[model samples]
Target chain A: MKTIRRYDVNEDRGHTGLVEAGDFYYLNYCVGNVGQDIESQINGAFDEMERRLALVGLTLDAVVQMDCLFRDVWNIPVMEKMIKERFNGRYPARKSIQTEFAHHGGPQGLLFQVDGVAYSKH
Target chain B: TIRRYDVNEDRGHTGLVEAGDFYYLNYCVGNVGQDIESQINGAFDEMERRLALVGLTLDAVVQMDCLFRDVWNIPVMEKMIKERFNGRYPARKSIQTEFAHHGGPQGLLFQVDGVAYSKH
Candidate 1:
């Protein structure tokens, strides 16, 4: 029952990059040329995520889940604020855990990265 | 620099169907309160077994998504993850969801999937 039309750098965040499956869409979140500290890095990733969602006229409201992988687990609260702020009271299912990247990122130095699936307005 | 799903051919199971350079397998265990320590240990061993089957090791993983019924159980898994990954900390995400018979319908209290290998 497995079939796909591969995209880009996907994640356990499920199709980490971006993929349209079933009645939803998936997008990967990670700080890229966004910021340094994990906070802004998250904000940047979310900012980018929102910006990307706009391409297909999708909104955070459509995001059913947000899998946040941070270098430090303490930033879970910080990420919650951003998620709440974005979804407008409706928060997506979030997953946060600790993992070490290349100091700043994977050779790129982007600490926080996100990827998830959401319902698509078909 | 990015891509998004546009048609049904884009994915499967509401999850990515393409392995590409990454192989993902989410192992789920039922029968709660049954030797979680044992389950956790066995799960890791199973992960290794599966990875080895494909000539891969835990080191190949770059990102992981962990679903848990109880958040406290994380310490249990984390300790092993540290040992399994051996400092090759990949990206990971964990969420706390409903569980047990009286909690939710989905018998899914724990799910751990990983994105192994990213152009490495």
Candidate 2:
């Protein structure tokens, strides 16, 4: 749009998306090239999200809320480990769910997908 | 908790809800076996309808997500998105999700979620 700031944050797959008129950023994409596991995949995704946010000079601290989609439902315990470590109790509001990939999938393809919102005053 | 119409703002109606700095809206629509235009616009229409509740539009959305049924339509979907946001895209993610559709009849190609700024 003419009155918004847009750019490519999808270095993982290269979607080349954008921003809007508001001072907010949308983080939508997979955690990374995933393997077949719950723990590592979640960690990788969060780490990737954190890494990308820092590129814009922001951090996980900037995120207000997030939506998480899991391909399977067998790793909440491990998922919790990463959550506790990364968030350090200062967690953003979040939602969890299970779904299938539009492409192809199985027990060892993708484990998770996350999308969310972050903002800055400037 | 109590509501009348989905987009009725005539008398203190608020189909659109807010929590802090983020405003949330939701829509459920299927694009399976449908034309690219209808499916894409269908989801957008849902977003617009909800935004009208609080006197807002897609223009105010800062973050958005689209769950697709497959990867074949990603390029086309992106094209429609560019047209809709006019290059001013919000933070977004599109993942192939077919499992969610199973809860009902298992036939939606896309469902969208967005968070907007109240000031806009």
Candidate 3:
């Protein structure tokens, strides 16, 4: 069995948190709302993911599953479009849902929370 | 948009049906019938009715999830599903578990995608 943990990214945390337990790796981060610029918020979240992956010598392409939470379900199309554009059609199994309300009352809030099976080297 | 429906045509059965870019159906089995094909056909009819309400049909299904009380009867159910849907092989996943809720023959989950308005 593996353990799960959570972290807060708003405290100027440089690279979110990536934990490896048993055979899985967990990556989580929260993106603040920056006006109506949802795309930039997406980029920022993914950037944090990339930075964390770098610490473990990995890349975003290696992710196998992701779950996204948004302030609004209608934002699905926009966020999905951005994800498709960035990932170039190759994406992990995922589920997205709208939060009760925007985190901190920003027009929108995005979170890139993911879990992956770790790579093993002989 | 997901389409929902409830109706009885000739046969005596009632259940909730939903269809969208993909169609998903959940139903309760009334009785054990020797003619498996007939029972399956009835279910398909219900599924077709639900899909048609949304201006779509069975061909839109892209995935299926099936639950059964007896895992051994899978072959019988699979044959019927494949025959009705034709060769449009949608991604499928099936599991065998105790039917704790809604005691019936079985429950099915189906999905369809890549729907078109006009056939060319």
Return the TM-scores of chain A for each candidate in numbered order.
Answer: 0.74, 0.79, 0.66
For residues B66-89, could you state the per-residue lDDT of candidate 2 as single tens digits? 776665677777777767765455
TM-score against native, each model? 0.46, 0.68, 0.40
The numbered model that scores best in lDDT is: 2
lDDT of 1 by residue, A81-119 (tens): 666565555444344545565554544466777876556
TM-score winner among the candidates? 2
Model 2 Cα lDDT, one tens digit per residue, A1-122: 35445565444343434343356666756466576577777878887778667767778888887878777656666777888998887778887777665555665677787776677876
What candidate 2 gets wrong by more than 4 Å, as runs, is: A1-4, A9-24, A119-122, B1-23, B28-37, B46-59, B67-76, B94-109, B118-120
TM-score-based ranking, best first?
Answer: 2, 1, 3
* Model 3 per-residue lDDT tens digits across residues A13-45: 564377654334567643433443666766666
Encode model 3's per-residue lDDT on B1-120: one tens digit a residue. Answer: 222244332221112233222223433332234244444466556556655666666676555444454456668767887888787755765544432233344432221112222232
Higher-ranked by lDDT: 1 or 3: 1
Candidate maximizing DockQ: 2
State the fnat of candidate 1 relative to the true structure: 0.00
Q: What is the lDDT of candidate 2?
A: 0.65
User: What are the per-model numbers of colliding residue pairs?
Assistant: 13, 7, 5
In model 1, where do residues sit more than 4 Å from their true spots? A1-16, A102-109, B1-120
Model 3 stretches with alpha carbons more than 4 Å out: A1-16, A32-36, A106-122, B1-120
- In candidate 3, residue A39 scores what lDDT? 65
